[PDB]
Design a protein around this ligand. Structure first.
Ligand SMILES: Nc1ccn([C@H]2CC[C@@H](COP(=O)(O)OP(=O)(O)OP(=O)(O)O)O2)c(=O)n1
Ligand SMILES: [Mg+2]
Ligand SMILES: [Mg+2]
Ligand SMILES: [Mg+2]
Lengths: 686, 105
DNA sequence: CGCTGGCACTGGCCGT
DNA sequence: CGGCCAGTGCCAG
């Protein structure tokens, strides 16, 4: 086993130079540094460990170091270098598994101060090394007079870069041993720093193997990116911008401008009594100024063109134009129109969401009509922000290869689900929401032309059917002997619930069923179905009666975690996952959700892994220079680009086979299924 | 004696006034504005003959102030044939206002 | 008590 | 001004 880390001249997308690397070998117990001219030797050392059936530990190597080395080896040495998946370990992947209840800075991409809770120390250090190194560099320069440019700290190799490289490895080694010391994941009887790769994976908890496989697959997905139709979105942006402008014009006609005090320093005090009046706007008594300018002995002093007069106080003000995006502005104008706010926030502000707006009623028919323009305006902004103007807008993220390479934290959610960001490809507007079709169609395999034939690719969308309800059926099978598990596969469960619950859309039945299943109150249930708390109660009891094993499952969970409870006294604060890991429970009332969401997340995770493996053993190659390419994984759905329709048909069938395999793999008590769709883009494939 | 202006009567009551017009841009929530209010009530009485005192509440009449770059209140604009002859911002005292009016009239 | 997530906007606050 | 940072809401699964 060896522990390594490299320093290169840029992020993966454009790295062209290997600066240095460090290797700590457990069999010699020594550190070895490789500088720029030692690159070939460094790669030799890594491959040697692979030939010994050994292991290579990197911190975030799955997403960076490993792919970077393959790329750099080709560019600089014109060498083929491909460390095998089974030979690599990632302490970041391990940390995220073992310390799943904690956040992390994603290697410095997120500010540490914005994250809730605590952060594991060694990982925090590793995450701050780049910024920390930049500080040293900048200081040393301004210490030498020279100026600091853009981000020159990474342009060339130097001895301070070398030292940081060494510290990263010592810290990574420490992190590794801290994680390996976790008896729950690694049996005490085995020294995992002294075993071959096969022993490492087969002797450690199943979750360790699954997490590394998921991270390796997902890093590949990021590199693939999602073919994106830049042109169509730029055109969408024009359309949205035009509509925004017109709504602004109409709204600013209806709701005119006004003045507000601003920039006042002094306190206004009663001139008579002289007592401070903190409720009055702050004022500003000038010191310079008078009617005339200083002298002129019997010859009219020149008038002071000055706008002020020392002594005479005034209230500084700013002119403000109605901003439809300001909840404050909307609040002000509507109450001024006779609106009586009913519900406020835990801070004294009147709620101004879509529910209230839809219910606001004012006498003036024009303003009454402006409320609909405001609803539209806010929605338009949501679309513009996400597609074009936001900091993480799709248009700011399109790469030169015409794809968006969204990032994925394979195990970012406490339950075992992944998180997505930069931009979040797991929150693209649904095809049935305003502008959804255009948004969704812009992401698609059709937008990628084959590198050889120039023909567009095809898309295969596969989504697990009624995932969490089947997870429920599984866990309550010990209470109802598989009754629900059997009933659930009698026609589509969500469509069936929709009808019985007499709901408008199939999607509405899903939001309802899961809201109900996971503790929504009588009122919240009502809101979801567009009714009152009375209707909420009806559905609650109506569905609980149908399957009383739900209460039984809920009770057993509680009896397993709690012994008494504000504030809670825990018997054990974690659920054992399907693959053996500890799933931290945050609250007794969300426990059932923790159990079901985790099960569904681990099933889907093993599913995408098994699907790709089955495709590979069938002869398909993963990549744009091959047969298929993962473009996105959104909880229980994968979108996959395919070179041909026939390959898409095979991916869809293979995804189903793999799902059934996962179900059998963990002796699930409910049969697991998937639904696949072939098409040119995401609007058609989901 | 004081003229209570509106956005729609501002042009003819002030800009076509043909005479000296002192306009007071104010607001009900301004401390200084409440202070000078009583001073204006008297300045109107006294200067009746060579000057007209008018007030414009910027909340009820939001369209006029912006055209004069109002940055603070109370704002006192002395108009002369549709053109600002002098401007002073602040709760001047009785005497001070008089000094201002005599110096520009 | 729906829960798990990311992220855009406004508006208060502070330092090149 | 541009980072920070609470408040608020909405997008998706
Ligand atoms: N409002 C929602 C929607 C979904 N989910 C969770 C539970 C199911 C999982 C995946 O979502 P869907 O695929 O939308 O649900 P499904 O039950 O798999 O429905 P379908 O059969 O249509 O895919 O996400 C949730 O907690 N709350
Ligand atoms: Mg590194
Ligand atoms: Mg599904
Ligand atoms: Mg889904």
């Amino acid at each position: 086993m060896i522990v390594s880390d490299i320093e290169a001249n840029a992020l993966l997308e454009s790295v062209t130079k290997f600066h240095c690397g460090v290797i700590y070998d457990y069999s010699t117990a020594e550190y070895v540094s490789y500088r720029p001219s030692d690159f070939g030797a460094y790669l030799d050392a890594l491959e040697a460990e692979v030939a010994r059936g050994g292991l290579i530990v990197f911190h975030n190597g799955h997403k960076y170091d490993v792919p970077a080395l393959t790329k750099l080896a080709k560019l600089q040495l014109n060498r083929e270098f491909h460390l095998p998946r089974e030979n690599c370990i990632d302490t970041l992947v391990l940390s995220r598994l073992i310390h799943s209840n904690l956040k992390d800075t994603d290697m410095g991409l997120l500010r540490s101060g914005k994250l809730p809770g605590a952060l594991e120390a060694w990982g925090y250090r590793l995450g701050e090394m780049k910024g920390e190194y930049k500080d040293d560099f900048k200081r040393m320069l301004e210490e030498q007079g020279e100026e600091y440019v853009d981000g020159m700290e990474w342009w060339n190799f130097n001895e301070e870069m070398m030292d940081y490289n060494v510290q990263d490895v010592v810290v990574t080694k420490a992190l590794l041993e801290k994680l390996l010391s976790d008896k729950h994941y690694f049996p005490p009887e085995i020294d995992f720093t002294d075993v071959g790769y096969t022993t490492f994976w087969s002797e450690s908890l199943e979750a360790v193997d699954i997490e590394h496989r998921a991270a390796w697959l997902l890093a590949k997905q990021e590199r693939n990116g999602f073919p994106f139709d830049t042109k169509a979105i730029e055109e969408l942006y024009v359309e949205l911008a035009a509509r925004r402008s017109e709504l602004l014009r109409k709204l600013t006609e209806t709701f005119g401008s006004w003045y507000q005090p601003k920039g006042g320093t002094e306190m206004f005090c009663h001139p008579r009594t002289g007592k401070p009046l903190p409720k009055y706007p702050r004022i500003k008594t000038p010191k310079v100024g008078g009617i005339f300018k200083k002298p002129e002995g019997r010859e009219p002093c020149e008038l002071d063109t000055r706008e002020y007069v020392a002594g005479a106080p005034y209230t500084p003000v700013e002119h403000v134009v109605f901003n439809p995006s300001s909840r404050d502005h909307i609040q002000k104008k509507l109450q001024e129109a006779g609106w009586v706010p009913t519900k406020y926030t835990d801070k004294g502000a009147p709620v101004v969401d879509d529910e209230v707006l839809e219910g606001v009623r004012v006498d003036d028919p024009e303003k009454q009509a402006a409320i609909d323009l405001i609803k539209e305006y806010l929605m338009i902004q949501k679309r513009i922000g996400q597609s074009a103007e936001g900091d993480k807008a799709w248009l700011r993220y399109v790469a030169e290869d015409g794809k968006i390479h969204g990032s994925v934290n394979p195990n970012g959610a406490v339950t075992g689900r992944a998180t997505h960001a930069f931009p979040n490809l797991a929150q693209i507007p649904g095809v049935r929401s305003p502008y959804g079709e255009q948004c969704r169609a812009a992401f698609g395999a059709e937008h990628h032309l084959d590198g050889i034939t120039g023909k567009p690719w095809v898309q295969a969308g596969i989504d697990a059917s009624g995932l969490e309800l089947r997870c429920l059926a599984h866990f309550m099978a010990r209470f109802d002997n598989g009754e629900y598990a059997h009933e659930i596969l009698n026609g589509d469960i969500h469509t069936k619930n929709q009808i019985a619950a007499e709901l408008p859309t199939r999607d509405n039945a899903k939001t309802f069923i899961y809201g109900f299943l996971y503790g929504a109150g009588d009122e919240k249930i009502g809101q979801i179905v567009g009714a009152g708390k009375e209707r909420g109660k009806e559905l609650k009891k109506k569905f609980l009666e149908n399957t009383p094993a739900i209460a039984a499952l809920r009770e057993s969970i509680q009896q397993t975690l709690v012994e008494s409870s504000q504030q809670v006294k825990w018997k054990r604060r974690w659920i054992k996952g399907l693959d053996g890991r500890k799933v931290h429970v945050r609250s007794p009332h969300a426990a059932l959700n923790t159990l079901l969401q985790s099960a569904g997340a681990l099933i889907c995770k093993l599913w995408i892994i098994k699907t790709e493996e089955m495709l590979v053993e069938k002869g398909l190659k993963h990549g744009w220079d091959g047969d298929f390419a993962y473009m996105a994984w959104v909880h229980d759905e994968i979108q996959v680009g395919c070179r041909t329709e026939e390959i898409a048909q095979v991916v869809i069938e293979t995804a189903q086979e793999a799902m059934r395999w996962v179900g059998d793999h963990w002796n699930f008590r409910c049969l697991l299924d998937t639904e696949g769709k072939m098409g040119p883009n995401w609007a058609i494939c989901h | 004696k004081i003229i209570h202006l509106t956005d729609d009567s501002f042009d003819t009551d002030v800009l076509k006034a043909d005479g000296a017009i002192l306009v007071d841009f104010w607001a009900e929530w301004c401390g200084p504005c409440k202070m000078i209010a009583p001073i204006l009530d008297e300045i109107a009485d006294e200067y009746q003959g060579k000057l007209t005192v008018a007030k414009l509440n910027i909340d009820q009449n939001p369209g006029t102030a912006p055209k004069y770059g109002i940055r603070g209140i109370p704002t006192l604009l002395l108009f002369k044939n549709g053109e600002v002859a002098a401007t002073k911002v602040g709760a001047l005292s009785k005497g001070q206002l008089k000094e201002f009016l005599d110096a520009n009239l």
